[PDB]
Amino acid sequence: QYSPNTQQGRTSIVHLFEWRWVDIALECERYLAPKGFGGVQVSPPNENVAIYNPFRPWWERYQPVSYKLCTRSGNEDEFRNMVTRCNNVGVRIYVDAVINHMCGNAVSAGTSSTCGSYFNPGSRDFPAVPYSGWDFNDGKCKTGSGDIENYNDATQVRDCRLTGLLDLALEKDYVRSKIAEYMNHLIDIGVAGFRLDASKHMWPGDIKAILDKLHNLNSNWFPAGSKPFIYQEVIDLGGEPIKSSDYFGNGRVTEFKYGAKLGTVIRKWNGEKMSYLKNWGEGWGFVPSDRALVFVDNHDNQRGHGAGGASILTFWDARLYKMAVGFMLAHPYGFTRVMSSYRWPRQFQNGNDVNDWVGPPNNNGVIKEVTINPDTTCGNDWVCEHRWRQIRNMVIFRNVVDGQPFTNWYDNGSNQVAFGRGNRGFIVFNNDDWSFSLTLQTGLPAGTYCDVISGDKINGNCTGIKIYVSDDGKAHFSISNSAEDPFIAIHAESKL
Ligand SMILES: *[C@@H]1O[C@@](F)(CO)[C@@H](O[C@H]2O[C@H](CO)[C@@H](O)[C@H](O)[C@H]2O)[C@H](O)[C@H]1O
Ligand SMILES: OC[C@]1(F)O[C@H](F)[C@H](O)[C@@H](O)[C@@H]1O
Ligand SMILES: OC[C@]1(F)O[C@H](F)[C@H](O)[C@@H](O)[C@@H]1O
Ligand SMILES: [Ca+2]
Ligand SMILES: [Cl-]
């Protein structure tokens, strides 16, 4: 459960949020494989409710109608084509599994679904699965509203409806089997693992029972006995009865404290400073590294829809965002997930974005293809953060230093810090309101290294900043607080 199942040397996965299967397949071959990306988290591939009010919101995909591989991202044929092509290039696919619930209980009955399947939330009828009233927790939930009302009561959080979403009776073998049937279908197709959506709303024991029915990965691409990578979406910040540790027996868990705290630190909120990141990781109360799935932002909290709050950094905060992602990718703690999003008309009113529901770039509801600009950036309103030189090069940095220890830490007692990874890499950050000019011990072999943030190493030459490491491993670093990117990163493969 705990191993990502990525190719040796590939240490990160990217969330291609709302991307079409055909576009992902191409991205795997043209960019992800050549650039060393480990895998891709795809949006829910199962049929969901088609919501027109608002117009096709991104969250409609988290309201299942059936387990048919039929969505705005493509059909089963397109999905299989993508998994196959990506796997053939050594890039894994991880499915966002929405198994805790079906659609909202108040959703109108009919065929307003991505595959035309009929469903009736009111009567608990989902014939395409099939599911009936006997498969939901209507009788198990003890709240007066039938929905989750108090998170201080661990029982209702699992047996009641999350904001009205019909809650599946996961204790029933029939329900467990139907979900396993869906997941096994995906595994046999070639997926390497899953993100278990709303895991906090599922009993650890129920998840385990379901995972116990899962197949080993497809033996045509993976070694015998390979188990699907499992990372459970559990939002666990401050004081709550439910702890993400309650799910360690099933696989990894999303560490939402990671992005929340990193955001507050880089934003320098309430006295926080980068010098405090010296003991980053378990020292900050985070889950063990081998059970952590980390990220700066996710599809939910990048639009104030999830845990983290206003401290979460996103592509909207480009400069600080690159620094946060850079620190994450350089630091050894956990398995890293990079976010890839689309632009939307953010409309802030009284502190809240009233357009936080807007779905992916589209034409009359049809998701737009991802176009690639001559400079390798994306068009059609796709942000493609994973294609940003500063982020892509850090994804590679993590690969190059894989296994190397956290060492040679330095800090000015404020927001100027630096550290290395064994003798394979070194990174320096300046988040202070003044320039940083100092000679530091890099632990790297003597030579000339290309800074992979400001530039690239191309045919024996650096396109950006150049760093010179002496025989004693020391090197001079100069970063103005006015620099486009106030951080420098160099590694074994950026050496001339
Ligand atoms: C997991 O599935 C969710 F449904 C619940 O965590 C997603 O939540 C989004 O969709 C819901 C149904 O449309 C909305 O009610 C909810 O406000 C919205 O955040 C969640 O994003 C997924 O990670
Ligand atoms: O994750 C599941 C669990 F909480 O911890 C361990 F996995 C146990 O084996 C299992 O029976 C229990 O329900
Ligand atoms: O341990 C059993 C379980 F996983 O967690 C709780 F005990 C629930 O009451 C039960 O229905 C569920 O199957
Ligand atoms: Ca539940
Ligand atoms: Cl997540």
XYZ file of C-alpha atoms and ligand atoms in Angstrom:
547
model
C 0.000 0.000 0.000
C 2.781 2.295 1.060
C 5.092 2.191 -1.955
C 4.182 4.483 -4.894
C 5.211 1.796 -7.388
C 6.979 4.422 -9.478
C 9.997 3.605 -11.618
C 13.258 3.659 -9.685
C 14.561 7.209 -9.858
C 11.150 8.898 -10.201
C 10.092 10.444 -6.890
C 7.015 12.618 -7.572
C 3.493 12.480 -8.948
C 1.550 15.298 -10.578
C -2.138 16.053 -10.264
C -3.408 16.724 -13.777
C -6.631 18.195 -12.403
C -9.584 17.798 -14.803
C -7.302 16.846 -17.693
C -8.712 14.714 -20.506
C -7.351 11.176 -20.887
C -6.041 11.810 -24.405
C -4.186 14.891 -23.160
C -2.649 12.988 -20.251
C -1.484 10.170 -22.524
C 0.307 12.717 -24.712
C 1.770 14.519 -21.707
C 3.150 11.203 -20.452
C 5.072 10.591 -23.668
C 6.092 14.163 -24.550
C 6.955 15.568 -21.111
C 6.389 13.477 -17.974
C 8.554 10.538 -19.045
C 11.458 12.602 -20.445
C 11.362 14.933 -17.417
C 11.401 12.119 -14.862
C 7.908 12.459 -13.379
C 6.824 9.384 -11.431
C 3.106 9.389 -12.065
C -0.165 11.192 -12.501
C -3.150 11.602 -10.236
C -6.213 11.678 -12.457
C -9.630 13.120 -11.711
C -12.398 10.619 -10.856
C -12.804 8.356 -13.939
C -16.263 7.074 -12.944
C -19.600 8.498 -14.145
C -20.787 11.518 -12.167
C -23.770 13.846 -12.007
C -23.917 16.471 -14.721
C -24.633 19.728 -12.890
C -25.793 22.736 -14.898
C -26.486 25.028 -11.946
C -23.799 26.205 -11.582
C -22.498 25.313 -15.051
C -20.450 22.100 -14.889
C -18.569 22.818 -11.623
C -15.364 20.908 -10.918
C -16.978 19.389 -7.813
C -19.669 17.631 -9.869
C -17.070 14.882 -10.391
C -17.191 14.071 -6.690
C -20.845 13.074 -6.942
C -20.858 9.517 -8.391
C -23.731 8.066 -10.404
C -22.088 4.776 -11.391
C -18.703 3.110 -11.793
C -18.767 3.296 -15.566
C -15.512 4.784 -16.893
C -17.403 7.558 -18.613
C -16.701 11.215 -17.828
C -15.881 14.583 -19.356
C -12.267 13.356 -19.418
C -13.154 10.509 -21.779
C -14.559 6.969 -22.031
C -13.129 3.576 -21.030
C -11.335 3.174 -24.355
C -9.607 6.531 -23.939
C -8.863 5.766 -20.289
C -7.289 2.407 -21.137
C -5.291 4.008 -23.933
C -3.917 6.572 -21.488
C -2.983 4.064 -18.779
C -1.299 1.827 -21.342
C 0.648 4.608 -23.053
C 1.721 6.130 -19.751
C 2.768 2.773 -18.301
C 4.686 1.979 -21.494
C 6.741 5.106 -20.865
C 7.251 4.388 -17.165
C 4.701 6.913 -15.900
C 2.127 5.605 -13.422
C -1.530 6.475 -13.109
C -3.266 6.916 -9.745
C -7.040 7.105 -9.585
C -9.009 9.500 -7.409
C -11.402 6.977 -5.870
C -14.733 8.405 -4.729
C -16.025 5.461 -2.715
C -17.402 6.960 0.495
C -20.523 8.296 -1.163
C -22.692 8.750 -4.205
C -24.288 12.077 -5.239
C -26.146 14.648 -3.132
C -29.396 13.333 -1.647
C -31.260 16.396 -2.950
C -30.090 15.996 -6.565
C -32.971 15.591 -9.032
C -33.633 12.095 -10.369
C -33.151 11.506 -14.079
C -30.378 10.994 -16.605
C -28.337 14.129 -15.965
C -25.125 12.097 -15.789
C -21.891 12.018 -17.800
C -22.882 8.687 -19.371
C -26.648 9.063 -19.407
C -27.165 6.506 -16.641
C -30.416 6.864 -14.743
C -30.372 7.545 -11.011
C -32.763 8.638 -8.279
C -31.069 10.072 -5.169
C -34.438 10.480 -3.485
C -35.253 6.767 -3.625
C -31.578 5.792 -3.228
C -31.722 4.120 -6.637
C -28.533 3.804 -8.693
C -29.388 0.949 -11.129
C -26.158 1.303 -13.095
C -24.125 -0.045 -10.170
C -26.569 -1.268 -8.871
C -27.210 0.311 -5.484
C -30.472 0.630 -3.561
C -31.738 2.026 -0.270
C -30.282 -1.039 1.457
C -26.799 0.143 0.500
C -26.812 3.499 2.325
C -26.351 4.578 5.970
C -29.752 6.271 6.242
C -30.616 4.021 9.171
C -27.130 3.982 10.690
C -26.693 7.758 10.988
C -28.038 9.133 14.277
C -28.031 12.896 13.585
C -31.308 14.797 13.362
C -30.467 16.125 9.897
C -28.965 12.932 8.515
C -25.835 14.916 7.647
C -22.566 15.393 9.523
C -23.098 18.083 12.167
C -20.347 17.684 14.768
C -16.778 16.583 14.045
C -16.273 15.962 17.763
C -18.353 12.806 17.287
C -16.197 10.350 15.311
C -19.199 8.082 14.681
C -21.442 10.527 12.804
C -18.449 11.739 10.785
C -18.314 8.241 9.269
C -21.982 7.146 9.223
C -23.673 10.411 8.235
C -23.819 12.378 4.982
C -20.970 14.756 4.244
C -22.817 17.947 3.250
C -25.731 15.798 2.084
C -23.737 13.311 -0.013
C -25.449 9.908 0.120
C -23.257 7.821 2.443
C -22.597 4.251 1.319
C -22.912 1.454 3.885
C -19.264 0.389 3.683
C -19.715 -2.298 6.349
C -21.820 -4.377 3.927
C -19.933 -6.993 1.932
C -22.090 -6.242 -1.106
C -21.091 -2.573 -1.072
C -17.462 -3.425 -0.347
C -17.539 -5.872 -3.260
C -19.088 -3.373 -5.686
C -16.376 -0.869 -4.860
C -13.707 -3.557 -5.141
C -15.150 -4.568 -8.509
C -14.670 -0.993 -9.701
C -11.172 -0.654 -8.273
C -10.089 -4.080 -9.570
C -11.347 -3.084 -12.992
C -8.977 -0.112 -12.837
C -6.051 -2.127 -11.444
C -6.359 -4.732 -14.209
C -6.392 -1.888 -16.705
C -3.053 -0.821 -15.300
C -3.463 1.815 -12.575
C -0.730 1.769 -9.918
C -2.703 3.079 -6.955
C -5.464 5.287 -5.617
C -6.278 8.397 -3.703
C -9.080 7.483 -1.305
C -11.326 10.509 -1.261
C -13.005 11.445 2.033
C -11.133 8.771 3.994
C -11.863 10.549 7.286
C -15.517 9.800 6.534
C -14.827 6.085 6.281
C -14.037 3.645 9.074
C -10.397 2.492 8.987
C -11.689 -1.065 9.286
C -14.051 -0.684 6.341
C -11.301 0.683 4.113
C -9.113 -2.266 5.097
C -11.871 -4.734 4.186
C -12.157 -3.145 0.753
C -8.399 -3.064 0.197
C -8.291 -6.749 1.144
C -10.338 -7.491 -1.981
C -7.973 -5.644 -4.340
C -5.809 -7.378 -6.934
C -2.074 -7.107 -7.271
C -0.912 -4.700 -9.990
C -1.062 -5.824 -13.644
C 1.770 -8.348 -14.062
C 2.419 -7.151 -17.619
C 4.044 -3.985 -16.248
C 4.655 -4.623 -12.535
C 6.579 -7.362 -10.697
C 4.530 -10.128 -9.088
C 3.141 -9.276 -5.661
C 3.011 -5.532 -6.315
C 0.306 -3.871 -4.225
C -1.580 -0.747 -5.297
C -0.269 2.485 -3.783
C -2.832 3.820 -1.322
C -2.983 7.404 -0.079
C -6.037 8.274 1.983
C -7.422 11.796 1.968
C -7.682 12.560 5.645
C -7.885 16.170 6.739
C -6.369 16.197 10.214
C -5.172 19.492 11.629
C -5.746 20.620 15.207
C -7.741 18.945 17.970
C -10.121 16.354 16.531
C -11.087 12.877 17.803
C -10.179 11.339 14.449
C -6.457 11.213 13.688
C -4.780 10.433 10.377
C -2.705 7.866 12.282
C -5.864 5.764 12.656
C -5.436 4.972 8.942
C -1.744 3.908 8.890
C -2.759 0.262 8.657
C -4.258 0.861 5.199
C -1.575 2.959 3.533
C -0.287 6.523 3.419
C -2.298 9.589 4.313
C -2.441 13.109 2.966
C -0.583 15.413 5.346
C -2.607 18.623 5.168
C -0.558 20.132 7.998
C 2.325 20.250 5.535
C 0.940 22.820 3.098
C -0.901 24.742 5.796
C 2.230 25.274 7.910
C 4.560 25.779 4.949
C 2.185 28.450 3.702
C 2.137 30.266 7.035
C 5.941 30.046 7.255
C 6.671 31.387 3.766
C 4.017 34.086 4.208
C 5.710 34.853 7.523
C 2.387 34.832 9.345
C 2.264 35.326 13.137
C 6.034 35.497 13.602
C 6.866 32.373 11.605
C 10.177 32.233 9.733
C 12.051 29.853 7.446
C 14.764 29.412 10.069
C 12.173 27.351 11.968
C 12.081 24.780 9.130
C 15.344 23.258 10.393
C 13.433 20.391 12.038
C 10.749 20.256 9.325
C 8.870 16.966 9.242
C 7.887 14.791 12.196
C 9.387 17.492 14.403
C 6.424 19.692 13.493
C 3.923 17.064 14.596
C 3.514 15.629 11.100
C 2.889 11.943 10.418
C 5.865 9.618 9.849
C 7.559 10.364 6.516
C 6.874 6.863 5.135
C 3.129 7.446 5.586
C 2.983 10.940 4.206
C 1.719 12.199 0.896
C 2.752 15.848 0.808
C 1.864 18.844 -1.309
C 1.797 22.630 -1.099
C -1.777 22.907 -2.346
C -4.449 20.575 -3.688
C -7.474 20.916 -5.982
C -9.610 21.649 -2.918
C -7.690 24.151 -0.805
C -6.227 26.058 -3.754
C -9.729 27.523 -4.054
C -10.626 27.736 -0.370
C -12.549 24.461 -0.577
C -10.286 22.508 1.752
C -7.954 22.348 4.744
C -5.202 24.920 5.089
C -7.259 28.081 4.996
C -6.013 31.388 3.634
C -2.386 30.365 4.271
C -2.339 27.917 1.345
C -0.034 29.045 -1.452
C -1.104 28.515 -5.073
C -0.074 29.393 -8.625
C -1.829 32.728 -8.008
C 1.060 33.481 -5.620
C 3.603 32.420 -8.281
C 6.771 33.820 -6.668
C 6.192 32.488 -3.140
C 4.570 29.346 -4.554
C 7.702 28.345 -6.465
C 9.715 28.759 -3.284
C 7.313 26.603 -1.276
C 7.261 23.895 -3.940
C 11.039 24.123 -4.202
C 11.548 23.616 -0.476
C 9.140 20.682 -0.513
C 10.846 19.004 -3.476
C 14.298 19.474 -1.935
C 13.323 18.248 1.538
C 13.403 14.436 2.144
C 10.188 14.287 4.178
C 7.399 12.286 2.518
C 6.270 11.485 -1.017
C 5.687 14.640 -3.043
C 2.700 15.505 -5.191
C 2.892 18.496 -7.504
C -0.252 20.407 -8.407
C -1.258 21.239 -11.978
C -4.284 23.470 -12.361
C -6.347 25.623 -14.644
C -7.112 29.319 -14.461
C -10.544 30.567 -13.462
C -12.110 34.010 -12.976
C -11.405 34.479 -9.274
C -13.983 36.918 -7.904
C -13.356 37.857 -4.281
C -16.278 39.251 -2.300
C -16.064 39.755 1.459
C -12.989 37.530 1.443
C -14.518 34.596 -0.455
C -14.144 33.667 -4.135
C -17.692 33.446 -5.521
C -16.347 31.711 -8.637
C -14.596 28.913 -6.721
C -17.003 26.461 -8.394
C -15.890 27.150 -11.980
C -14.931 23.957 -13.786
C -12.023 23.367 -16.230
C -11.518 25.407 -19.434
C -14.349 24.412 -21.743
C -16.453 25.116 -24.802
C -20.166 24.656 -24.117
C -19.267 22.187 -21.365
C -16.637 20.306 -23.372
C -13.229 20.366 -21.690
C -10.629 22.127 -23.828
C -7.530 20.290 -24.961
C -4.184 21.174 -23.453
C -2.229 23.136 -26.042
C 1.541 23.545 -25.798
C 3.148 26.895 -26.551
C 6.559 27.178 -28.267
C 8.112 28.087 -24.900
C 6.772 24.785 -23.491
C 4.115 26.552 -21.415
C 0.424 25.705 -21.769
C -2.450 27.539 -23.398
C -6.247 27.267 -23.207
C -6.132 28.546 -19.616
C -4.227 25.522 -18.312
C -1.621 26.718 -15.804
C 0.657 23.670 -16.090
C 2.734 24.460 -12.986
C 4.563 21.169 -13.536
C 5.970 22.712 -16.714
C 7.357 25.784 -14.960
C 11.152 25.612 -15.206
C 11.512 26.294 -11.464
C 9.149 23.454 -10.569
C 10.070 20.946 -13.261
C 13.770 21.327 -12.432
C 13.047 20.753 -8.743
C 11.129 17.606 -9.598
C 14.360 16.455 -11.237
C 16.394 17.705 -8.266
C 14.439 15.372 -5.984
C 15.187 12.457 -8.325
C 18.906 13.236 -8.441
C 19.258 13.448 -4.643
C 16.938 10.511 -3.858
C 18.245 8.691 -0.787
C 20.709 11.409 0.241
C 20.443 12.732 3.810
C 19.387 16.155 5.035
C 22.603 17.950 5.992
C 24.651 21.137 5.980
C 21.716 23.207 7.214
C 22.211 26.956 7.550
C 20.056 29.870 8.643
C 20.464 33.536 9.573
C 17.963 33.318 12.409
C 15.419 34.878 10.082
C 14.237 33.865 6.604
C 17.546 33.062 4.925
C 18.261 29.341 5.000
C 19.979 26.592 3.072
C 20.638 22.880 3.187
C 21.970 20.004 1.192
C 21.145 16.447 0.343
C 24.203 14.306 0.936
C 26.751 15.218 -1.717
C 24.257 15.293 -4.581
C 22.452 18.588 -4.033
C 22.229 21.946 -2.286
C 19.514 24.605 -2.073
C 19.524 28.195 -0.776
C 16.527 30.392 0.065
C 16.160 34.106 0.746
C 12.738 35.081 2.049
C 13.991 38.122 3.955
C 13.514 41.765 2.966
C 17.247 42.122 2.290
C 19.925 40.564 0.077
C 21.680 37.317 0.926
C 25.390 37.168 0.135
C 27.468 34.543 1.895
C 29.808 31.593 1.447
C 28.266 28.314 2.578
C 29.340 24.692 2.859
C 27.538 22.748 0.115
C 28.955 19.287 0.776
C 29.242 19.012 -3.012
C 32.362 18.074 -5.007
C 34.384 20.968 -6.459
C 33.227 22.364 -9.784
C 30.870 24.709 -11.610
C 27.154 24.091 -11.143
C 24.195 25.535 -12.999
C 21.415 27.021 -10.889
C 18.320 25.100 -12.030
C 15.939 27.778 -10.760
C 17.132 30.771 -12.788
C 18.200 28.592 -15.696
C 19.157 25.213 -17.107
C 22.181 23.170 -18.037
C 22.277 23.020 -21.821
C 25.129 21.481 -23.824
C 27.834 22.068 -21.226
C 26.650 25.589 -20.388
C 24.379 27.325 -17.871
C 21.600 29.609 -19.108
C 21.217 31.260 -15.726
C 23.189 31.741 -12.528
C 26.424 29.801 -12.092
C 27.780 28.534 -8.778
C 31.419 27.706 -8.059
C 32.182 25.105 -5.380
C 35.740 25.054 -3.987
C 37.873 22.075 -2.931
C 36.506 22.423 0.605
C 32.920 22.187 -0.624
C 32.261 25.862 0.082
C 30.549 28.109 -2.463
C 29.409 31.716 -2.610
C 25.703 32.406 -2.974
C 24.165 35.786 -3.740
C 20.400 36.277 -3.778
C 18.742 39.686 -3.796
C 15.292 39.950 -2.219
C 14.254 41.506 -5.538
C 15.229 38.473 -7.637
C 12.513 36.905 -9.809
C 13.074 33.712 -7.823
C 14.734 34.271 -4.421
C 16.222 30.784 -4.252
C 19.046 28.851 -5.910
C 19.311 25.086 -6.428
C 22.185 23.009 -7.784
C 22.717 19.260 -8.011
C 25.017 16.509 -9.296
C 23.359 16.566 -12.729
C 23.560 20.358 -13.033
C 27.351 20.239 -12.787
C 29.292 21.333 -15.874
C -13.418 14.330 -2.183
O -14.842 14.239 -2.549
C -15.640 15.395 -2.163
F -16.934 15.240 -2.565
C -15.758 15.530 -0.585
O -14.479 15.668 0.096
C -15.019 16.659 -2.822
O -15.745 17.826 -2.386
C -16.191 18.706 -3.352
O -17.403 18.173 -3.959
C -18.585 18.063 -3.101
C -19.731 17.471 -3.951
O -19.905 18.175 -5.157
C -18.937 19.480 -2.506
O -20.066 19.379 -1.654
C -17.710 19.951 -1.693
O -17.948 21.224 -1.109
C -16.482 20.074 -2.656
O -15.349 20.476 -1.888
C -13.527 16.793 -2.469
O -12.988 17.924 -3.118
C -12.773 15.521 -2.912
O -11.393 15.601 -2.588
O -6.513 -0.036 9.101
C -7.427 -0.990 9.687
C -7.192 -1.183 11.230
F -7.655 -0.045 11.827
O -5.773 -1.342 11.576
C -5.085 -2.507 11.047
F -5.053 -2.463 9.703
C -5.861 -3.795 11.449
O -5.270 -4.940 10.880
C -7.369 -3.699 11.009
O -8.110 -4.898 11.358
C -8.007 -2.414 11.663
O -9.407 -2.276 11.269
O -14.495 -1.976 13.074
C -15.700 -2.087 12.294
C -15.898 -0.776 11.455
F -14.896 -0.812 10.527
O -15.779 0.433 12.311
C -16.821 0.627 13.343
F -16.735 -0.315 14.319
C -18.228 0.617 12.660
O -19.255 0.761 13.638
C -18.424 -0.685 11.823
O -19.697 -0.682 11.189
C -17.292 -0.785 10.766
O -17.456 -1.980 9.949
Ca -19.193 7.520 5.378
Cl -5.648 15.315 -1.571
